[PDB]
Write a protein that binds this ligand. Structure first.
Ligand code: LLQ
Lengths: 186, 206
């Protein structure tokens, strides 16, 4: 029932029926900053990294949108958080496009930057590697099937190595009522 | 450490993480120094077998008995007490670079029960005790504080070191703590002049 909805349907028609792409820019510019700020307060490193992303990443207006802003290329896309689970990239990226559940495609140039520049930085540094490393022997059995912790046991499953955090709702109202100049002045 | 570990509640949400890894570390560090000492006992036997001089051979053999007992088990006499001390201070250097090189504590106090007993029972003389302490000094004199960072080098130039040995002072009950060993340390410093050990005396109003 498309009467009066020419704009949204034109946007949605172009992307429905398409395989999502892996966009690497957030992860690239995040990593580029973080590797220079090691040892500083983590949220300070993180803010500097987000500023690096804000300055260097491609900015976008989706064709025909009234809203400005994406965090990755046109089409359906996802982005990367190697701080969580970068130790999986070597095992998973090759199989992403043929994944029975939720396939993704990755462009060859993007994959080259991902595996040659991004993933090597995060070796020995990911949250997943650290958790797997230190988990008490009495707990491993119900947690991971394998010594690298790449396979869950699906008995007592940890869920912190595939996401940064629980769900969250920020205070949007505060942002629109005050603006970030006033928040910064605070 | 093992007993503390058995007393944790390893069914609760926290002990397995907050406390057990520390007690595991303590169990391991106790093995470390004991393993190290045991390898010395065997080195002494092998050295004894390769040594023709009968006297030094017996010396090396008594050394092996000593290193088999201490620091794993309580010292039984002055010679075991000193070699225990020696293992702890040398393994402390392996542990870390404590400023000034690790200090030696109130040697005249904690060695005195061993020294008095062996003296009385005729297993030890004061000349032999003094020789053993002086053996400590000449091997301490071969461990040189190595500062790489120029700041450390210029704040401790000339291999500056202060491996303090404390004699005299007061007991934990606040009476004078002078004993025969206190005097022995001062005699040895006069008789055997040398830049080791850093002999430090506690003074009080009495
Ligand atoms: O509460 S969370 O475990 O972060 C996510 C759940 O709300 C939706 O998947």
């Amino acid at each position: 029932n498309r009467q009066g909805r020419e704009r949204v349907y034109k946007i949605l028609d172009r992307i429905q029926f398409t395989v999502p792409h892996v966009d690497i820019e957030r992860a690239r510019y995040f990593t580029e900053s973080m590797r220079q700020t090691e040892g500083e307060l983590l949220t300070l490193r993180w803010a500097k990294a987000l500023k690096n992303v804000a300055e260097k990443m491609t900015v976008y207006i989706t064709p025909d949108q009234l809203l400005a802003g994406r965090v990755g290329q046109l089409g359906r896309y996802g982005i990367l958080y190697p701080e969580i689970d970068g130790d999986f990239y070597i095992e998973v990226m090759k199989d992403l496009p043929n994944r029975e559940k939720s396939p993704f495609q990755i462009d060859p140039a993007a994959a080259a930057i991902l595996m040659e520049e991004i993933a090597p930085y995060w070796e020995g540094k990911t949250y997943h590697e650290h958790l797997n490393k230190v988990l008490p022997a009495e707990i491993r059995g119900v947690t991971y099937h394998d010594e690298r912790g790449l396979k869950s046991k699906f008995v007592v499953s940890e869920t912190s190595s595939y996401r940064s955090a629980l769900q969250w709702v920020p205070d949007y109202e505060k942002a629109m009522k005050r603006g970030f100049i006033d928040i910064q002045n605070e | 450490a093992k007993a503390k570990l058995a007393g944790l509640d390893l069914t609760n949400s926290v002990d397995i993480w907050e406390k057990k890894p520390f007690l595991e570390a303590m169990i391991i560090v106790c093995d470390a120094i004991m393993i190290w000492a045991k390898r010395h006992a065997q080195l002494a036997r092998d050295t004894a077998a390769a040594t023709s001089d009968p006297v030094r051979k017996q010396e090396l053999l008594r050394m092996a008995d000593i290193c088999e007992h201490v620091p794993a088990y309580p010292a039984r006499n002055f010679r075991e007490a000193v070699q225990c001390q020696w293992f702890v201070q040398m393994f402390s250097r392996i542990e870390q670079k404590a400023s000034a090189i690790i200090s030696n504590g109130r040697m005249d106090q904690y060695l005195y029960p061993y020294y008095k007993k062996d003296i009385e029972e005729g297993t030890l003389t004061s000349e032999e005790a003094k020789e053993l302490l002086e053996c400590m000094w000449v091997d301490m004199a071969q461990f040189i504080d190595l500062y790489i960072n120029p700041t450390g080098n210029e704040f401790q130039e000339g291999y500056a070191h202060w491996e303090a040995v404390t004699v005299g002072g007061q007991t934990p009950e606040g009476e004078d703590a002078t004993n025969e060993l206190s005097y022995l340390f001062l005699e040895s410093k006069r008789e055997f002049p040398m830049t080791y050990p850093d002999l430090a005396v506690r003074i009080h109003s009495r």
